[PDB]
Write a protein that binds this DNA or RNA. Structure first.
Ligand SMILES: [Mg+2]
Ligand SMILES: [Mg+2]
Ligand SMILES: [Mg+2]
Ligand SMILES: [Mg+2]
Ligand SMILES: [Mg+2]
Ligand SMILES: [Mg+2]
Ligand SMILES: [Mg+2]
Ligand SMILES: [Mg+2]
Ligand SMILES: [Mg+2]
Ligand SMILES: [Mg+2]
Ligand SMILES: [Mg+2]
Ligand SMILES: [Mg+2]
Ligand SMILES: [Mg+2]
Ligand SMILES: [Mg+2]
Ligand SMILES: [Mg+2]
Ligand SMILES: [Mg+2]
Ligand SMILES: [Mg+2]
Ligand SMILES: [Mg+2]
Ligand SMILES: [Mg+2]
Ligand SMILES: [Mg+2]
Ligand SMILES: [Mg+2]
Ligand SMILES: [Mg+2]
Ligand SMILES: [Mg+2]
Ligand SMILES: [Mg+2]
Ligand SMILES: [Mg+2]
Ligand SMILES: [Mg+2]
Ligand SMILES: [Mg+2]
Ligand SMILES: [Mg+2]
Lengths: 129, 155, 81, 25, 144, 150, 91
RNA sequence: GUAGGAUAGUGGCCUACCAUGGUUUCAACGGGUAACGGGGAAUAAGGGUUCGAUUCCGGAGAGGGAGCCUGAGAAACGGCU
RNA sequence: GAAGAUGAUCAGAUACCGUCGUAGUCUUAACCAUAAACUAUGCCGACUAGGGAUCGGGUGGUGUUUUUUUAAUGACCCACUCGGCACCUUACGAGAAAUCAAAGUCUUUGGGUUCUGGGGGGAGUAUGGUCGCAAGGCUGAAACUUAAAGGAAUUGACGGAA
């Protein structure tokens, strides 16, 4: 059954970005999906995304521009102390100069760089590069 | 607990060194000793006004609560003035970066100030060794509703 | 097509698609103001109406249930909604 | 050697082994 | 989902699954059954002294064609009979029947080496005076 | 998809976007409610009340037109049955299959389907006992069930 | 409790007579001692009364039957066959 | 559980009378250990794998068991029976 | 038609072939619990590519057939749609390849979960337990031995293959 709507959303985004589409459609559009997409959009990996409100769970149409290589989900959401964020970045990211590991942190869903600037850590969601 | 046969044993059940003087009739009937257990644990009015004895009670008995203050789900009220609680937790295996469900069964003395049943969340507090396996008293019972008011039959 | 408008798909496409697989899922069914040849009163009958619907005053079957839409029977007249 | 017939050979060896084991026991 | 469980609370299933599939290795199975002490004539040890019983000449395996010049050695610490290769040119002239040799293993942790069938040990010393040193010219073998 | 089958069918209702609806409705919410209560006095399951309201009358959704669901209206009017509707309709099927099986003892797939139906009953009854709709230690004993559902 | 694992009614025979023979007699001593339902009053009160006789304790009615069952399969086949031939003859 | 005894003292530690409990697939109980536990050690991308009788800490033992004397402290063995 | 009988042939004495024929094949009551039980491809879920054909259901044609002056229902045609057994083209991708719309979305490695494998033999053997009336089924080693066993494809050779 459907166990991770963020994994389904990010799989749809990867599969459309691989085949070169400029847009996806994502069902069923959680808050974690919206915040993850807002981080990706803030860092420039997607364009505008628009939330269709049907009265059940929502859909999202994301405008993929061209600049995404691999957005993914680290499932399970591992507990991540502040000392081993850098193991996760060294494992998941292609280089030290770009790419972001998205963390669910009690200061909000955020990437690892402004998890480090706020000196906060927590569960891992996934990555974008 | 003002009823159900306090003197049910071969010995006279009384609080030690508490004297009921028969020559001078006391203004309050059958003088009772109680205490606050400390740590914000309210002495129940059943403990204050009851007739039970329970020398291992944390409020009317001779034990003191000191040390760990644990919390657990009652799984067995099948003893006399002793319950078994389940302290379920999660153990972290650092190889797999994952946890495993574990549990520990803690036998706890329960006062007859408290009426407990299987399913109640109780707060227990460490005392001196009460028996071979019991080192804790129930100091608080944390199940008031328990979703057990709407199960009964209707018309 | 590699680039398309997913927020505003064409009405011909949305009328082709399944009722669950549109942009917002809604029903393709409808209701009918149905009158008998005999009685003057009006009955509101579902399109896919599952039931031998009669009037309150009539003794007459208005629709007969089928696999999909109910078959409006016996020369009765209908209007949508 | 077909594996089917080697299996049947070892199955007959099973019967002889348990026959002599029940003979001794 | 690539086989294995992934969830955060699924560490017992992963740990016991690794513990169960860990037995299919040669070394873990051998080390936890303790077969080096139950079997494998040198009881977990590197070397063992024994007493030569008879000089053997083992036919080498095909396609090689030679006589391998071993000895039958009864170990002091077990009483187990092994076959030990006397590992240079000559050197069977150096041993005897009925004297004390030190044996080592033969390179392959069991697993009889090369064209020698069923010989998995070798003679390092005879009478405590070291076959290589006897073979070069370096030492003289004691008469008793 | 189809917990006791291999079917993958999507055959559901697609209720509309309008949560207040449908602007040709000229009957009142209390008239809809007393029609619901009248149908339950006749003895109708909430599914049968809803289908009759939908087809004979114009009541598209009773949740939309009133403020309440049909089973909630029946509970407020004192007409809730002793076991829930889908569980009762599962126990009815199970006792019909068992009555069939006592004659046709050779019916191996009716035996199999009976196991499926009881498994479904026990899962549903377990849910109802945790959400406290059914009493605790309510058991489908499959010997008294024929009188449980008459 | 469960007094015996598998002998059942043939635990009275002890270790004697052979296991196959005691199984064969167990499957028929269950059959000849079972209470059967009456075809006349519906109560499960039919008992055997010197093989071939099956008497209901209510309503006192006695039916001829098999030696250990009320209706053997050959007799039920005969009943169906005679029903079929009678329906063919009188129609 | 109650009461006593005993102890330096809690306690089924033991006794007397009651109750029938207590642990377990979250692995109890049993079997093996060529197992003393730990600080630690070897190998080092990261994670790990293996070792730790051994200089520090804690335990246990003085050929095997048991019992005790003296003493603040021992069930001591370069003390006794 | 196992077994068994018999007739021929064959170097040895092709067991193939011919004629019989018990058990069996069928059925009732009880057992067994295995198959190359195969799609050698666990189950749930999402996405990624074009196509036509078909099965079941649904929807729409001022379509054909029942031409009877604006000709019910079935059958058929066309277009959609959901669900299914599959199929054709391509290789985005995957793979050691054969090939695969899944065996893809995997070193850019994490959707959920169960089971299994760890070089070839020894060996599905020994022993223990348990199930069975038995046959056997489930569970299931070790000593020892060994440098390959194997998978896919290429060239050749060979075929009582074309
Ligand atoms: Mg006590
Ligand atoms: Mg589905
Ligand atoms: Mg299921
Ligand atoms: Mg005392
Ligand atoms: Mg005491
Ligand atoms: Mg006692
Ligand atoms: Mg030791
Ligand atoms: Mg490495
Ligand atoms: Mg250690
Ligand atoms: Mg140490
Ligand atoms: Mg040692
Ligand atoms: Mg020390
Ligand atoms: Mg000592
Ligand atoms: Mg010594
Ligand atoms: Mg000693
Ligand atoms: Mg002194
Ligand atoms: Mg001593
Ligand atoms: Mg000394
Ligand atoms: Mg000393
Ligand atoms: Mg199999
Ligand atoms: Mg298979
Ligand atoms: Mg399954
Ligand atoms: Mg299709
Ligand atoms: Mg192997
Ligand atoms: Mg097996
Ligand atoms: Mg066996
Ligand atoms: Mg093969
Ligand atoms: Mg090959």
């Amino acid at each position: 059954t459907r166990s991770s709507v963020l994994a389904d959303a990010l799989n749809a985004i990867n599969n459309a970005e691989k085949t070169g589409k400029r847009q996806v459609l994502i069902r069923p559009s959680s808050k974690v999906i919206i915040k993850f997409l807002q981080v990706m959009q803030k860092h420039g990996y997607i364009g505008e995304f628009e939330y269709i409100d049907d009265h059940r769970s929502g859909k999202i149409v994301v405008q993929l521009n061209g600049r995404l290589n691999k957005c993914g989900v680290i499932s399970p959401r591992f507990n991540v102390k502040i000392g081993d964020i850098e193991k996760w970045t060294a494992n998941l990211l292609p280089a030290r100069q770009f790419g972001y590991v998205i963390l669910t942190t009690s200061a909000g869903i955020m990437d690892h760089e402004e998890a480090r600037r706020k000196h906060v850590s927590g569960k891992i969601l996934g990555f974008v590069y | 607990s003002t009823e159900l046969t306090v003197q049910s044993e071969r010995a006279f059940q009384k609080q030690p060194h508490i004297f009921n003087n028969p020559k001078v009739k006391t203004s309050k009937r059958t003088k009772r000793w109680y205490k606050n257990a400390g740590l914000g644990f309210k002495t129940p009015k059943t403990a204050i006004e009851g007739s039970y004895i329970d020398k291992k009670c944390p409020f009317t008995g001779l034990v003191s609560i000191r040390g760990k203050i644990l919390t657990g789900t009652v799984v067995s009220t099948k003893m006399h003035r002793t319950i078994v609680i389940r302290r379920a937790y999660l153990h972290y295996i650092p190889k797999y970066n994952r946890y495993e469900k574990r549990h520990k069964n803690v036998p706890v003395h329960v006062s007859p100030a408290f009426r407990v049943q299987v399913g109640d969340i109780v707060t227990v507090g460490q005392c001196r060794p009460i028996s071979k396996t019991v080192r804790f008293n129930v100091v608080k019972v944390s199940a008031a509703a328990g979703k057990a008011n709407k199960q009964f039959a209707k018309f | 097509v590699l680039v398309q408008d997913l927020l505003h798909p064409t009405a011909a496409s949305e009328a082709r698609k399944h009722k669950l697989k549109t942009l917002v899922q809604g029903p393709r069914s409808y209701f009918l103001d149905v009158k008998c040849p005999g009685c003057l009163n009006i009955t509101t009958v579902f399109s896919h109406a599952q039931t031998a619907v009669t009037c309150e005053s009539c003794s007459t079957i208005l629709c007969t249930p089928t696999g999909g839409k109910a078959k409006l029977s016996e020369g009765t007249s209908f209007r949508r909604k | 050697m077909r594996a089917k017939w080697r299996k049947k050979r070892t199955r007959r060896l099973k019967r002889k082994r348990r026959k002599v084991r029940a003979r001794s026991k | 989902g690539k086989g294995k469980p992934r969830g955060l609370n699924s560490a017992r299933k992963l740990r016991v699954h690794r513990r169960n599939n860990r037995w299919a290795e040669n070394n873990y199975k051998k080390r936890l059954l303790g077969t080096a002490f139950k079997s494998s004539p040198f009881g977990g040890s590197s070397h063992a002294k024994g007493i030569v019983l008879e000089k053997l000449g083992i036919e080498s395996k095909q396609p090689n064609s030679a006589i391998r010049k071993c000895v039958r050695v009864q170990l002091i610490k077990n009483g187990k009979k092994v076959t030990a290769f006397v590992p240079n040119d000559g050197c069977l002239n150096f041993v005897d029947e009925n004297d004390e040799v030190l044996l080592a293993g033969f390179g392959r942790k069991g697993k009889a080496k090369g064209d020698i069938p069923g010989v998995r040990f070798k003679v390092v010393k005879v009478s405590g005076v070291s076959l290589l040193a006897l073979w070069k010219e370096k030492k003289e073998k004691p008469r008793s | 998809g189809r917990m006791h089958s291999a079917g993958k069918g999507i055959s559901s209702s697609a209720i509309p976007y309008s949560r207040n609806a449908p602007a040709w409705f000229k009957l009142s919410s209390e008239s809809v409610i007393e029609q619901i209560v009248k149908y339950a006095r006749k003895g109708l399951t909430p599914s049968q009340i809803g289908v009759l309201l939908r087809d004979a009358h114009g009541v598209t959704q009773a949740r939309v037109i009133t403020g309440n669901k049909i089973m909630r209206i029946l509970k407020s009017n004192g007409l809730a049955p002793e076991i829930p509707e889908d569980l009762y309709y599962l126990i009815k099927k199970a006792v019909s299959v068992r009555k069939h099986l006592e004659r046709n003892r050779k019916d191996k797939d009716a035996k199999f389907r009976l196991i499926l139906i009881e498994s479904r009953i026990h899962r549903l009854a377990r849910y109802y006992r945790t959400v406290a709709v059914l009493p605790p230690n309510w058991k489908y004993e499959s010997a008294t069930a024929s009188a449980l559902v008459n | 409790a469960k007094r015996t694992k598998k002998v059942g009614i043939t635990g009275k025979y002890g270790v004697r007579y052979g296991s196959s023979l005691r199984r064969q007699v167990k499957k028929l001593e269950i059959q000849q001692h079972a209470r059967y339902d009456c075809s006349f009053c519906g109560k499960k009160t039919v008992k055997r009364g010197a093989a071939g006789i099956w008497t209901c304790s209510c309503c006192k009615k006695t039916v001829a039957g098999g030696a250990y069952t009320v209706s053997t399969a050959a007799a039920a086949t005969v009943r169906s066959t005679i029903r079929r031939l009678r329906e063919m003859v009188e129609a």
